[PDB]
Amino acid sequence: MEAKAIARYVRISPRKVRLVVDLIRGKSLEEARNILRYTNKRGAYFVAKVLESAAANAVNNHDMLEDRLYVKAAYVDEGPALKRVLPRARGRADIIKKRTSHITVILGEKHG
Amino acid sequence: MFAIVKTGGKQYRVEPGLKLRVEKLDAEPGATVELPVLLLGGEKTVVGTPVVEGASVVAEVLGHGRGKKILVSKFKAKVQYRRKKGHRQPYTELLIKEIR
Amino acid sequence: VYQIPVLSPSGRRELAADLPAEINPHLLWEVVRWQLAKRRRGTASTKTRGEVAYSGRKIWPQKHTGRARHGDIGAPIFVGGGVVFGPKPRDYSYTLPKKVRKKGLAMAVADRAREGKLLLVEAFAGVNGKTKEFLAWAKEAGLDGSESVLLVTGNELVRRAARNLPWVVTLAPEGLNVYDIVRTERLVMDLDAWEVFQNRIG
Amino acid sequence: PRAKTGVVRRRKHKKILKLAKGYWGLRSKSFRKARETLFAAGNYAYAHRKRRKRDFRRLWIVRINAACRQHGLNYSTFIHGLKKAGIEVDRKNLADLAVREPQVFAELVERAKAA
Amino acid sequence: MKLSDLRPNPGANKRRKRVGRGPGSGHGKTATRGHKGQKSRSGGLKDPRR
RNA sequence: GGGAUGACCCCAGGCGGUAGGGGAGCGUUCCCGAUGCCGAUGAAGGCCGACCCGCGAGGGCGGCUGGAGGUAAGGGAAGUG
RNA sequence: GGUGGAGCCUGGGAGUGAGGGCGCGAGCGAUAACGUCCGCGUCCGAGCGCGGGAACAACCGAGACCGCCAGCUAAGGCCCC
RNA sequence: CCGUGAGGGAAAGGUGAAAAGAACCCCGGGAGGGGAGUGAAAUAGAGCCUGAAACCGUGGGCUUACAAGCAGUCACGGCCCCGCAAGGGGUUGUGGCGUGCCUAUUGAAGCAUGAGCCGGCGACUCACGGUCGUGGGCGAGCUUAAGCCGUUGAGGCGGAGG
Ligand SMILES: [Mg+2]
Ligand SMILES: [Mg+2]
Ligand SMILES: [Mg+2]
Ligand SMILES: [Mg+2]
Ligand SMILES: [Mg+2]
Ligand SMILES: [Mg+2]
Ligand SMILES: [Mg+2]
Ligand SMILES: [Mg+2]
Ligand SMILES: [Mg+2]
Ligand SMILES: [Mg+2]
Ligand SMILES: [Mg+2]
Ligand SMILES: [Mg+2]
Ligand SMILES: [Mg+2]
Ligand SMILES: [Mg+2]
Ligand SMILES: [Mg+2]
Ligand SMILES: [Mg+2]
Ligand SMILES: [Mg+2]
Ligand SMILES: [Mg+2]
Ligand SMILES: [Mg+2]
Ligand SMILES: [Mg+2]
Ligand SMILES: [Mg+2]
Ligand SMILES: [Mg+2]
Ligand SMILES: [Mg+2]
Ligand SMILES: [Mg+2]
Ligand SMILES: [Mg+2]
Ligand SMILES: [Mg+2]
Ligand SMILES: [Mg+2]
Ligand SMILES: [Mg+2]
Ligand SMILES: [Mg+2]
Ligand SMILES: [Mg+2]
Ligand SMILES: [Mg+2]
Ligand SMILES: [Mg+2]
Ligand SMILES: [Mg+2]
Ligand SMILES: [Mg+2]
Ligand SMILES: [Mg+2]
Ligand SMILES: [Mg+2]
Ligand SMILES: [Mg+2]
Ligand SMILES: [Mg+2]
Ligand SMILES: [Mg+2]
Ligand SMILES: [Mg+2]
Ligand SMILES: [Mg+2]
Ligand SMILES: [Mg+2]
Ligand SMILES: [Mg+2]
Ligand SMILES: [Mg+2]
Ligand SMILES: [Mg+2]
Ligand SMILES: [Mg+2]
Ligand SMILES: [Mg+2]
Ligand SMILES: [Mg+2]
Ligand SMILES: [Mg+2]
Ligand SMILES: [Mg+2]
Ligand SMILES: [Mg+2]
Ligand SMILES: [Mg+2]
Ligand SMILES: [Mg+2]
Ligand SMILES: [Mg+2]
Ligand SMILES: [Mg+2]
Ligand SMILES: [Mg+2]
Ligand SMILES: [Mg+2]
Ligand SMILES: [Mg+2]
Ligand SMILES: [Mg+2]
Ligand SMILES: [Mg+2]
Ligand SMILES: [Mg+2]
Ligand SMILES: [Mg+2]
Ligand SMILES: [Mg+2]
Ligand SMILES: [Mg+2]
Ligand SMILES: [Mg+2]
Ligand SMILES: [Mg+2]
Ligand SMILES: [Mg+2]
Ligand SMILES: [Mg+2]
Ligand SMILES: [Mg+2]
Ligand SMILES: [Mg+2]
Ligand SMILES: [Mg+2]
Ligand SMILES: [Mg+2]
């Protein structure tokens, strides 16, 4: 049995948040818990939330027995990007895109 | 024992009991074929001449195939010239039964 | 073709007629082509760069912007611009030699008649139009609705009687047209009609 | 009536991109690079089917010309002693002779040395 | 004789008009028009009969 | 030549190709065919295929998806690649 | 003599009307130019398809309908690459 | 929305038969999600029919750190996969060979033009005349126009004229 959480439309760049997600993959839930707290990235917050909801969802829904949880697989896909206008020199105006991440943590049970 | 036989303008090394694919020849299926006249024995010294006569190989005509399609293509740059032609090549199959 | 089975309530008798012996499938086809052309609505239209609702103004300057070069946005090269050689209203009708029309009529009958499929009748009595009534007289005349019928009579009452049948198509005699003959499996007339059909061809 | 592109152009492009599966970069994923790549895979294949024949004959020969020098003569003469003895059986494809059946080779070198 | 059989003789179909569509058919690119200049231009040459 | 007045066997030849000329086909939208036929025991569209037919454009078939349409043979007309 | 993708007549559709290299014959140039202008041929143009020339449109070989893990040759080659 | 003004002038349609539009519970500040429930279908959940391509991502198979290249093609071999095997699919180590597409030019891989990639829009037409060809009707003739009558998308009449 396995359990997930998906945070959707998180306003943060997929490239940026993917990096911390890589930090905790295949980690026991307890090392994953410690790694994000002491990681310094705006995306350690957002992942830790998804981590938990999946940990919650695991025990609390699918009857998964917390102590053996690890992170089976996990990843952030790229949501729809909001575009804004950035006025520039000589009348010019580019557009910058504030992006979006769909964070997914998927939990499964250790075999010990 | 083996022969070295000649069919469709090519020359193959045959054992008796061997299924081997050969240029398409005119015959019904299941019929027998006497394969002219070959070129060598596998007990040696007979080689000789163009073709050692009185020996022959008898293979039975198994069936008439068409090989996997080759797509033959021709392109010529800057002249706006392309050609596509599919070609799959008729052939027959036979089983080598005994050697004369 | 020649020997044609009339129905008068007394006799089963046959009639000999006219009716060219050989037929010309092209000639037939050519009249059908005509008939379905001249009835074309001719109705499709579209807007040229000229008729489109935008302005005459030149989009950019044409040198030194480094975009490509342009006229008005109504130009067909633009999305939502004019159409190029698309449809305007036109009239698809043209005039067949009268003599071809006439031949093709006489022929289309004959083709039916040498199939035997043509039947002449008198008076019905599946008159007084009620499809239920007609449906009787028909089953008597051997029409079971096992093949399409083109009914030609000047009788208004026998017409409306037949009309709603899926397998029956109805016509006055001056309505005789080779299209409607060819789409119908067999042909049926009365001895008015058939007389005006004569007095028509030749 | 109006007939717009609809389903046609997608099927044409799709036909190509299957042909290119396995190529590098856009040449597998882009209709255009895929086409361009293919054109050349076309003529290359053709060319090399012509020269697949050339390629093999040389390998046949080198193996032949190899085994003779073992028995003390060269290729160029070996063919003559064989074109003479009438033995045009060798059909250099059977230098599969020379490897698998050595004593059948030796006896052929003999009718070859007697020219 | 039914509608399904009607159809014309071998000519007078004739249809199969001409083209500026693909390579292969000729009729392609420059489209019968031949490269060039004033004839290839849209409103064409000046009226040959004079 | 084979006399089958032919759609077909045999034999002999020709078949690099730009501007161009010629010829045969494939496919797309629409009409007659149609008050019909296919369809929820699954339409059009999509995703796969190492399978079958075609020289090729293409057509089949099969599986998955999809969920309400599609439209043979023969012919007609174009906002047809 | 010569049956040839030979010829001539009538008629429908053309494209071309910037050529280029090389051999040979001249003129211009300086018995210069990958120069220039003519003539006869050729080849590239359109054969940047194939083999040779180390590589290289036009020099030597040779006119590619398709397929083969069959053979003989051309120019050019046979010490090793 | 742009423009002082005349004036310019867009984008943007679709849950399901039915809102039955997901009470309640769990993580959460929320957003979002996980169970529950509805539903024939919920990767039909409202950023809602189908859901292509470019593009980004996770998992797997084969592979790569003494080679050098228009990226392919021919061959053999190693590994993985489908199987009845002589079989086929994937991948690619080594060896042969190999100067992108279009355009324009006597000549382009060309260090000459155009193109970041994908999807969709995108250019030889119609009318009337003319001229050849072709499929048919009638032939010393052929043929009607405007109009009149009639018509389930029924045709016929009309001979001025050409
Ligand atoms: Mg600034
Ligand atoms: Mg400013
Ligand atoms: Mg950008
Ligand atoms: Mg090239
Ligand atoms: Mg060129
Ligand atoms: Mg305007
Ligand atoms: Mg103006
Ligand atoms: Mg620019
Ligand atoms: Mg428009
Ligand atoms: Mg617009
Ligand atoms: Mg619009
Ligand atoms: Mg289009
Ligand atoms: Mg060779
Ligand atoms: Mg066209
Ligand atoms: Mg052409
Ligand atoms: Mg042509
Ligand atoms: Mg032309
Ligand atoms: Mg041009
Ligand atoms: Mg020019
Ligand atoms: Mg002009
Ligand atoms: Mg031939
Ligand atoms: Mg040709
Ligand atoms: Mg030629
Ligand atoms: Mg159902
Ligand atoms: Mg459709
Ligand atoms: Mg389907
Ligand atoms: Mg249809
Ligand atoms: Mg059709
Ligand atoms: Mg178009
Ligand atoms: Mg000629
Ligand atoms: Mg001429
Ligand atoms: Mg000039
Ligand atoms: Mg000149
Ligand atoms: Mg000159
Ligand atoms: Mg010249
Ligand atoms: Mg000089
Ligand atoms: Mg010069
Ligand atoms: Mg000059
Ligand atoms: Mg000059
Ligand atoms: Mg010259
Ligand atoms: Mg040129
Ligand atoms: Mg030439
Ligand atoms: Mg070159
Ligand atoms: Mg060379
Ligand atoms: Mg050359
Ligand atoms: Mg040739
Ligand atoms: Mg020599
Ligand atoms: Mg050398
Ligand atoms: Mg304002
Ligand atoms: Mg609805
Ligand atoms: Mg759900
Ligand atoms: Mg779905
Ligand atoms: Mg759905
Ligand atoms: Mg969306
Ligand atoms: Mg629906
Ligand atoms: Mg959807
Ligand atoms: Mg991966
Ligand atoms: Mg070293
Ligand atoms: Mg290494
Ligand atoms: Mg290689
Ligand atoms: Mg260009
Ligand atoms: Mg230019
Ligand atoms: Mg130039
Ligand atoms: Mg120049
Ligand atoms: Mg470059
Ligand atoms: Mg420049
Ligand atoms: Mg360039
Ligand atoms: Mg496109
Ligand atoms: Mg005209
Ligand atoms: Mg005309
Ligand atoms: Mg005539
Ligand atoms: Mg009226």
Tell me how crowded residue A33 is: count the other CB atoms within 10 A of its CB: 16
> Which backbone phi and psi does E46 adopt, to 5 degrees?
-90, 15
CB neighbour list of residue C166: distance below 8 Å, 6 or more residues apart: C145
CB pairs under 8 A between B and E: 6
Three-state secondary structure of A48-60: HHHHHHHHHHHHH
**Domain ranges within chain A, ordered by starting residue:** 2-110
Q: How far apart are CA C135 and CA C158, in angstroms?
A: 11
> What share of residues in chain E are helix, strand, coil (percent, to 5)?
5, 0, 95
C70 touches C62 (CB < 8 A): yes
Which of C69, C67, C71, C98 is CA-nearest to residue C82? C71
E and C make contact (3+ CB pairs below 8 Å): yes
For residue D29, say whether its CB is under 7 Å from any atom of strand F: no
B53 touches B28 (CB < 8 A): no
Three-state secondary structure of chain B: CCEEEECCCCEEEECCCEEEEEECCCCCCCCEEEECCCCCCCCCCCCCCCCCCCCCEEEEEEEEEECCCEEEEEEECCCCEEEEEEECCEEEEEEEEEEC
Q: Whose structure tokens read 């199969």?
A: E16
A72 touches A2 (CB < 8 A): yes
Q: Give me E18's structure tokens.
A: 């001409």
**Which nt is closest to the CA of B79, judged by C1'?**
F18
How many alpha carbons fall within 13 Å on the CB side of residue C183?
12
E strands, chain C, in order: 3-5, 14-16, 118-121, 149-152, 168-171, 186-190
Give the pairing type, strands C149-152 and C168-171: parallel
CB contacts of B11 in chain D (<8 Å) are: 89, 91, 93-94
Count, in order, helices (H) and strands (E) of chain D. Answer: 6, 0
From the candidates D57, D88, D89, which should be mutated to test the interface with B, based on the most B CB atoms within 10 A?
Answer: D89
Q: How far apart are CA C7 and CA C161, in angstroms?
A: 19
Q: How far apart are CA C103 and CA C105, in angstroms?
A: 5
Q: How far apart are CA C104 and CA C179, in angstroms?
A: 10
By CB atoms closer than 10 A (0-12, 13-18, 19+), residue E28 is: middle
CA distances from C90 to C30, C86, C87, C136, D33 (A): 21, 12, 8, 47, 45
Q: Does C30 touch chain E (CB under 8 A)?
A: yes
Q: How far apart are CA A82 and CA C101, in angstroms?
A: 70
From the candidates B5, B40, B46, which should be mutated to test the interface with D, based on the most D CB atoms within 10 A?
Answer: B40
Nearest-10 crossing angle of helices A14-23, A29-38: 130
Which of B46, B51, B44 is CA-nearest to residue B6? B51
> Which backbone phi and psi does A74 adopt, to 5 degrees?
-175, 155
Q: How far apart are CA C150 and CA C179, in angstroms?
A: 11
CB neighbour list of residue B34: distance below 8 Å, 6 or more residues apart: B56, B57, B58
Q: How far apart are CA A38 and CA C1, in angstroms?
A: 105
Which of C13, C8, C4 is CA-nearest to residue C122? C8
Nearest-10 crossing angle of helices D75-84, D102-113: 70
Question: Which window residues (79-98, chain D) lie with Cβ within 7 Å of strand F?
Answer: none
Q: Give me A41's structure tokens.
A: 């990235």
The CA radius of gyration of chain C, in Å to the nearest whole number, is 27
Length of chain A: 112
Residue type, C95: T
Q: How far apart are CA A70 and CA C37, in angstroms?
A: 76
Residue D88 DSSP one-character state? G
**Distance of alpha carbon E39 from its chain centroid, rounded?**
16
Q: How far apart are CA C127 and CA E34, in angstroms?
A: 72
Q: Which of B10, B45, B50 has its CB closest to that of D88?
A: B50
For residue C9, the distance in angstroms to the closest alpha carbon of chain E comes to 30
CB contacts of B71 in chain D (<8 Å) are: 42
Q: Which of residues 87-116 of C touch E (CB under 8 A)?
A: 108, 111-112
The DSSP result for A10-75, as a single string, is: ESS-HHHHHHHHHHSSS-BHHHHHHHHHH--SHHHHHHHHHHHHHHHHHHHHH---GGGEEEEEEE
Which of C110, C117, C107, C112 is CA-nearest to residue C1? C110
Q: How far apart are CA B10 and CA D58, in angstroms?
A: 17
For residue C111, the distance in angstroms to the closest alpha carbon of chain E comes to 7
How many alpha carbons fall within 13 Å on the CB side of residue B100?
17
Q: Does B74 touch chain D (CB under 8 A)?
A: yes
User: H-helix or E-strand containing C34?
Assistant: helix C25-38
Q: How far apart are CA C149 and CA C127, in angstroms?
A: 17
Residue E37 DSSP one-character state? S
**Which nt is closest to the CA of C174, judged by C1'?**
H155
CB contact under 8 Å between B13 and D40, yes or no, is: no
Length of chain C: 202
CB neighbour list of residue E22: distance below 8 Å, 6 or more residues apart: E28
Q: Give me D17's structure tokens.
A: 């991109």
C118 touches C187 (CB < 8 A): yes
**Distance of alpha carbon D85 from its chain centroid, rounded?**
30
Which of C100, C101, C97, C106 is CA-nearest to residue C20? C106
CB neighbour list of residue E4: distance below 8 Å, 6 or more residues apart: none
Which of C51, C36, C44 is CA-nearest to residue C177? C36
**Distance of alpha carbon B37 from its chain centroid, rounded?**
14
Q: How far apart are CA C135 and CA C118, in angstroms?
A: 19
Q: Which of D46, D96, D107 has its CB closest to that of B73?
A: D46
Residue type, D9: R
Q: How far apart are CA A22 and CA A14, in angstroms?
A: 12
The CA radius of gyration of chain B, in Å to the nearest whole number, is 18
Report the CATH architecture of A2-110.
Answer: Alpha-Beta Complex (3.90)
> Which backbone phi and psi does D88 adopt, to 5 degrees?
-50, 5
Q: How far apart are CA C142 and CA C36, in angstroms?
A: 32
C185 touches C148 (CB < 8 A): yes
Ordered strands of the B32-35 beta sheet: B18-23, B90-99, B57-66, B32-35
Across chain D, which distance is largest between two alpha carbons, in Å? 85
Which of A34, A33, A63, A68 is CA-nearest to residue A51? A33
Which of C172, C177, C166, C170 is CA-nearest to residue C192? C172
B and D make contact (3+ CB pairs below 8 Å): yes
By CB atoms closer than 10 A (0-12, 13-18, 19+), residue A1 is: exposed
Q: How far apart are CA C33 and CA C37, in angstroms?
A: 6
Residue type, C154: G
By CB atoms closer than 10 A (0-12, 13-18, 19+), residue E21 is: exposed
Alpha helices in chain E (DSSP H): none
Q: How far apart are CA A39 and CA A84, in angstroms?
A: 30
Q: Does C25 touch chain E (CB under 8 A)?
A: yes
Measure the N-to-C terminal CA separation of chain E; round to a whole number of Å.
54
Q: Whose structure tokens read 């005789």?
A: C176
Q: Does C80 touch chain E (CB under 8 A)?
A: no
A31 touches A13 (CB < 8 A): no
Q: How far apart are CA D93 and CA D57, in angstroms?
A: 7
**Which nt is closest to the CA of B74, judged by C1'?**
G49
> What share of residues in chain D are helix, strand, coil (percent, to 5)?
75, 0, 25
Give the pairing type, strands B18-23 and B90-99: antiparallel
- Resolution value in angstroms: 3.2
Distance B80 CA to ligand 43 centre (A): 17
CB neighbour list of residue B94: distance below 8 Å, 6 or more residues apart: B19, B20, B22, B33, B59, B60, B61, B62
Q: Whose structure tokens read 């790694």?
A: A35
C85 touches C47 (CB < 8 A): no
